[PDB]
Amino acid sequence: SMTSHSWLCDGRLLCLHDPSNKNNWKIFRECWKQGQPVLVSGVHKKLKSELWKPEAFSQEFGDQDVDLVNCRNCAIISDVKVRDFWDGFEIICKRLRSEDGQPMVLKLKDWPPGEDFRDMMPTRFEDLMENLPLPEYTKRDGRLNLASRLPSYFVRPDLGPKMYNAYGLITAEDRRVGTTNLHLDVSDAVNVMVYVGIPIGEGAHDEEVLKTIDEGDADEVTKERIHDHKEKPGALWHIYAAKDAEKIRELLRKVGEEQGQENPPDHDPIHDQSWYLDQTLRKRLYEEYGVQGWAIVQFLGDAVFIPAGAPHQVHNLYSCIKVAEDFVSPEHVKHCFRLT
Template sequence: MGLSVLEPHTSHSWLCDGRLLCLQDPSNSNNWKIFRECWKQGQPVLVSGIDKRLNSHLWRPDAFSKEFGDQDVDLVNCRNCAIISDVKVRDFWDGFEVIPKRLQDADGNPMVLKLKDWPPGEDFRDMMPTRFDDLMKNLPLPEYTKRDGRLNLAARLPNFFVRPDLGPKMYNAYGLISSEDRKVGTTNLHLDVSDAVNVMVYVGIPQGEPNHEQEAVINGRKEVMITIEEGRCG
């Protein structure tokens, strides 16, 4: 309540019994004022509505498959962390929303996969300039999150410091298929060396001919998507 009094000119709400600030207008120039009060306390902040500002056609699986499908990549089987080498990136993207097109394990079951380091290293800007510009143009809280943001201290570290990688990095993974998959995740628990802004640019609902267990999970995903849409948390 105190923060709302400090900055009444932002469209925001409080989630999780007042512990999570949700900024509802990513273009509001006053967002940084209320954000900094939460940031001082080490609290996360959720910004909704960014997906409505992005060029959605750029971030669809079929767009990545069409433009970059012939690139060689490594995949990770999220169920056992095994590396799958010597595959084309279209092998991942074509199965993103179509379960029958997914690579299968030795038992003939579709795997839960993620792309390993793609685009590699610091190649995002060079390999995907249009997507880079679309993302940079629509980052929330640009004072903090843009490379040249006036409050982005990482961009102003002296040269004798080892500067953190300011990204952006892409994270691409399938959703979990069965109830057994809930015991695993698509990334390991880790600690980043700097603060980060994470933007969910696309969420897909896989189609196919799943068994009853998979169908229940997919129906649950649809409910989540409806909740995200209604809450403007995309």
């Protein structure tokens, strides 16, 4: 039977089922006030699916100049055509290769660049913004979005949205690497999975995806969305409460020292965006510092709500197109205030 919502993460994560329900705020707002992330499923069913395909981005924008990142070693691939990224999104034999002859796991950096999404892609901008869940929080002009209403004593987010495009991580060694490393944002954000590409050529890599989800500490209900309903899983997230940020900094200063980094005792390993918490580090965070997180699998059409100040990291299971919008809720405005 169709229900308003369910619980993931053993009761600690709200999952809303109807992305456009006029009464969603009644279920959402107490979870949000307590500083929890929230998941909303079904956004893909509201979108024009033809606007969000990798082949359309290549045909329309392929001659633009961009930089890529090799996710395995952080090497920057400078000044290539954006088609060189898109044409290998799902077809492994078309991907740029490393010196060892293997196909690379690539991230497309800063594309579209800066605040240019709306100017470059007006039809896509309209399709995303008209179908965001919790529209009084998430729309530029929402009644509960303070972004356009605050003075300079507050850090204001850029004009969005922003697109996040990267291949899936593939090997046993890739399990310890991030697509996006551990960091925090001073605004709230909603991140929508608009396309998942499951490749061909090495298309049989479904086994290491199951081991990554399991070792990623995913709950038993999350493990059922695959096996029972064959939804397409895009990315594995870990999110931590804003109140636990300093304890995470203490763990990472101690691990940097153990590994022979030479950092002043005050440097900020979260702002540095240089760490990915693998199974070993997540267990050490729990056991040595008392900190538990939320392990979330973002399927096609899932929207992830990330609270301001909450440290978070992202590991792509398959090739993902994500679109995210920043907003400033009244519940979390303290995180962008410039005093005390």
